């Protein structure tokens, strides 16, 4: 049963904060083919080698895909410290993980283009005490708490957003800021792969 | 949203090797009521306290229920070495675990009684040589590889079962043996509670 990477090739890819994840188990994959459909600019892996994913059988493959400017290629990994790593997307690095940057070809009409690239500059929680900032750093494999108050596409750089937390939650406000980067002629997307050694039933496994 | 322990209170419970797992997420539970409907004969916990589960909140609650004789309560834990721990049911002991032994009251008509109590004396794998035996000890939170060849209720103690594994599986035969303990007047059942700490935590609280 071949792994279904169809959802990626159809639709406007989401922004980094609202990234889309496909979790594959009990399937066989051809990563060379998926990357054939795209123009790859960088493919750097941490606790795995791109070859070993294509030469070895593992329990699960997780592909998180999003629209990301190659202008910020350095910022995606935790090697570089900045807003994306702190408040937008974090892989469970230390586990076998790969980050790829790609430009969508003119041929790939199914992958549509966003109006602009957008990201969260900061997501923070101001407390009722006015003790103020308790910045909400992103958790790996999870979404920023500010995705509720941050628009799918940020209208303007420096846009600021707010939500009032319930008394039960502890009172206070959730505050966020947005930053925008202009869209390229061809969409530049970013792909995150996390492979898990797992125990038995090594199931994702090359073609 | 109350946790639904309803699947347990309706139907003939499975045998230990065929344990039924109910995973509860984003629900609230009162284990006092569930145990209230039964006559508890033991509530022993490791790495957790009966009452801490009732006083604190955890990411998930797993209850595994099965028909088990009180004759074998000593054997159920990893503390005692023997077939149930080796080839039938093993919990993640290092993780918080509770093992509960209870008798179904005459009032609980919905929990029906099996015709006898059954367990796997041995699950072993003869290899391609037709001599080598690799005993298939049960992994935790998983079923025996022999559940396919072992009957849901064993007709006679010492019954033997066989399956030929395909050449792709490494070849060989899968062999198993079964043991029978007579049914009591009132069904005696076994329950396994495993709770998990997590980033959210507030998923399975009490009350």
């Amino acid at each position, epitope marked *: 049963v071949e792994c279904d990477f169809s959802p990626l090739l159809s639709g406007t890819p989401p922004q980094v904060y609202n990234f889309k994840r496909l979790v594959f188990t009990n399937c066989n994959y051809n990563l060379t083919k998926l990357l054939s459909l795209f123009s790859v600019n960088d493919f750097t892996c941490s606790q795995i080698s791109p070859a070993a994913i294509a030469s070895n059988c593992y329990s699960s493959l997780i592909l998180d895909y999003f629209s990301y400017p190659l202008s910020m290629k350095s910022d995606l990994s*935790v090697s570089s*410290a900045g807003p994306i*790593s*702190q408040f937008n997307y*974090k892989q469970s*690095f230390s586990n076998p993980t790969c980050l790829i940057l790609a430009t969508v070809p003119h041929n790939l009409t199914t992958i549509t283009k966003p109006l602009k690239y957008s990201y969260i500059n*900061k997501c923070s*929680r101001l*407390l009722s005490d006015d*003790r*103020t*900032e*308790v*910045p*909400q*750093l*992103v*958790n*790996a494999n*999870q979404y920023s*708490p500010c995705v509720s108050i941050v628009p799918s596409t940020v209208w303007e750089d420096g846009d600021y957003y707010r939500k009032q937390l319930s008394p*039960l*939650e*502890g009172g*206070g406000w959730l505050v966020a800021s947005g930053s925008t980067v202009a869209m390229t002629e061809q969409l530049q997307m970013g792909f995150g792969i996390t492979v898990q050694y797992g125990t038995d039933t090594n199931s994702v496994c090359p073609k | 949203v109350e946790c639904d322990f309803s699947p347990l209170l309706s139907g003939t419970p499975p045998q230990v090797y065929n344990f039924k797992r109910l995973v509860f997420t984003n629900c609230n539970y009162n284990l006092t009521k569930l145990l209230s409907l039964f006559s508890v004969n033991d509530f022993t916990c490791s*790495q*957790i*306290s009966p009452a*801490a*589960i009732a006083s*604190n*909140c*955890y990411s998930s609650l797993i209850l595994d229920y099965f028909s088990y004789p009180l004759s074998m309560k000593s054997d159920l834990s990893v503390s005692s070495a023997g077939p149930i721990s080796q080839f039938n049911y093993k919990q993640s002991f290092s993780n*918080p675990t509770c093992l509960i032994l209870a008798t179904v009251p005459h009032n609980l008509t919905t929990i029906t009684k099996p015709l006898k109590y059954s367990y796997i004396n041995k699950c072993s794998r003869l290899l391609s040589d037709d001599r080598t035996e690799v005993p298939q000890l049960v992994n935790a939170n998983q079923y025996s590889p022999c559940v396919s060849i072992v009957p849901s209720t064993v007709w006679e103690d010492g019954d033997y079962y066989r399956k030929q594994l395909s050449p792709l599986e490494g070849g060989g035969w899968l062999v198993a043996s079964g043991s029978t303990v007579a049914m009591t007047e009132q069904l005696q059942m076994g329950f396994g509670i495993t*709770v998990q*700490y*997590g*980033t*959210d*935590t*507030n998923s399975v609280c009490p009350k």
Partner: nanobody
Amino acid sequence: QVQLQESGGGSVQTGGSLRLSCAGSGYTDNSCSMGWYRQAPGRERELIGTIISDGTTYYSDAVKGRFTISLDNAKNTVYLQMNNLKPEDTAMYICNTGWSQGSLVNRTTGWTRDCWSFGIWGQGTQVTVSS
């Protein structure tokens, strides 16, 4: 029972470096955010930074190049390294854990509390920097 205790405070001559401690009591594991703040007398509490277990840190942009935050997950202590300390830095340095997605747990007892609805504030330590 759960509390945080700061340490390493005292007197440093200007240009010096001090590393402070915020040990936590009553929790085997913390999945939450531990953060450092400074309050001068007559001045508001100002965020120094926030850290999580992975090593991810946020700096206030004024503590850039001088203040650093570290965490020891076992021995649950968060630390602040302050360098080129100057007289203006003299203030009370306090630490907080809480209000941050993850949970505080004691594996020995089975206790768990959600940091989103809970927070702990440390007593405080004073850094006096003199010429």
